[PDB]
């Protein structure tokens, strides 16, 4: 059936398990600066644990 391709599109593969964390720490919109600080620190802590 592939001898008569009529349309073709190239979609990007989903995000890796590592690139999935970048959405977590950035974009959570913490209330204050001290909260965002601990949030980013905890994300980097999970990264160093991994």
């Amino acid at each position: 059936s592939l001898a008569e391709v009529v349309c073709l599109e190239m979609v990007d593969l989903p995000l890796t398990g590592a690139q999935a964390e970048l959405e977590g720490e950035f974009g959570k919109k913490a209330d204050g600066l001290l909260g965002m600080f601990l949030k980013r620190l905890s994300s980097q802590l999970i990264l160093l644990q991994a």
Binding site: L22, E23, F26, M36, R40, Q44
Partner: protein, 101 residues
């Protein structure tokens, strides 16, 4: 005190951590293609504080100054340490017959 070295060390560590945080944020912004392109003020404050602390620390660990007036270094000298010439030393004194003949 001698704790300025630890101060500049902690400052440099905080600066490296802020650099890593900026790298992460840049990677995220290039991943999602946002038109804001604004670094988080949370990491900017850390970068500025670490820079200030580290600069103030290295200003202190650089070493102290010394007076320009030469008459200030010789104020404690005495003639007992200026008459002696290490080149013209002679060993035929009484110290040889007195101390350990």
């Amino acid at each position: 005190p001698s704790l300025w070295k630890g101060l500049v060390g902690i400052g440099l560590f905080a600066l490296a951590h802020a650099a890593f945080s900026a790298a992460q944020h840049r990677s995220y912004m290039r991943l999602t293609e946002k038109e804001d392109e604004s670094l988080p003020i949370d990491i900017v404050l850390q970068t500025l504080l670490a820079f200030a602390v580290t600069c103030y620390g290295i200003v202190h660990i650089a070493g102290e100054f010394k007076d320009m007036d030469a008459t200030s270094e010789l104020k404690n000298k005495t003639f007992d340490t200026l008459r002696n010439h290490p080149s013209f030393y002679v060993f035929n004194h009484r110290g040889r017959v007195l101390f350990r003949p």
